[PDB]
Amino acid sequence: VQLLEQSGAEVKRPGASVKVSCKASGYTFTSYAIHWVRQAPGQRLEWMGWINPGNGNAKYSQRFQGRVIISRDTSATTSYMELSSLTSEDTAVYSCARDRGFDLLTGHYLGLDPWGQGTLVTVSSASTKGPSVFPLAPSSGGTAALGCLVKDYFPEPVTVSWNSGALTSGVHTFPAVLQSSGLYSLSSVVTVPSSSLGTQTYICNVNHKPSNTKVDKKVEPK
Amino acid sequence: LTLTQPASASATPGQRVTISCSGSSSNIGGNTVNWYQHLPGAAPKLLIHNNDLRPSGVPDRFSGSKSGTSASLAVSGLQSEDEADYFCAAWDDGLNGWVFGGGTKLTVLGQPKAAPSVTLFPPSSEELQANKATLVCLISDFYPGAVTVAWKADSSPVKAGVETTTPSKQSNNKYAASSYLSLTPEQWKSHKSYSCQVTHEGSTVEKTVAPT
């Protein structure tokens, strides 16, 4: 099976440059063009350019000409897309795709197939910041909801568990909101028996690898 | 440039549904249309190439056609697994590169409406001690995945300091969303109450909290 495997998510400041990779396997790398495309949040796919990996000839959309370079390493069967002078408009998922080209016998176009999984690049001027975690004290019938607010962190992601992973029944962790400050916040809530509130300890475990921060926040009734 | 597709399409199981793609002489007019299926978290899957040809593996219930500067993907004997985003793609002679439609979200009709559960938390005492205040409105278990959230201070609408997430699918195939209202401790303490009001399919749920 043919695969295009892409490099991981990146966070960059305005004015920096990013280089995304696309590792090909399962076919003859030098015999097919590779295209690079991107998709910003809420917007449509936009084609950036393409390369013949056999000879390195790359061609670009006029919209990116002068600040994109597409290249390849044939020994590593990998293509690279480097985009310079980043602004927040460049936040997007960047994807590669293999050009199956035209059938030389029939003239049929065979399609862009397969595609890579995409690599998210986030361009932001925010500094790395660990979250402030606040308890959301229990609210009720025979169950009650209690939670944690994970406030003002950058960049993504945060991980949240409850009671070191011993509590999963009734746990709901919500997607983060991105605030005008450029910082993220999210909440996690768990539904638990009301009868347990006096006696059972509830702790949310929040880990934010980028700031090297871990918080274990105890959530008590009020 | 741009290929134009409807934002959504829908039909019941077993029905036939069509999705259109409109372009110009310099893309669809002169070159082939190619169609992709996009499922969450997965790379696009080629469904139709060269206007009407199915790759290996693609069910014969998918077909494509092209006429002039427009093209169509048809799915017959619609199945629930066909719920996905579908987008068209064609070479553009002016760009000398590919152009893509904005995609069409195909809904397979049948799932009944589900009403949201709403939980509203007031600011924690610890957050107030940090000189901040956040109200948290958590909304879950609703279908379809479209809601409106409005906040009130006493009885008046609040627009400032509100951030609301786009509804996301849960593992039970209903949707969830959250909304946050940011306040100063003084604002929180100065009002009789604040409310989160969630409207879904013409019904409203309102929850209210008070510093008291």
Binding site: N57, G107 | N96
Partner: peptide, 11 residues
């Protein structure tokens, strides 16, 4: 350039 011509030139 049409798609086939462009692809012919590139590849």
């Amino acid at each position: 350039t049409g798609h086939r011509m462009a692809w012919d030139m590139m590849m």
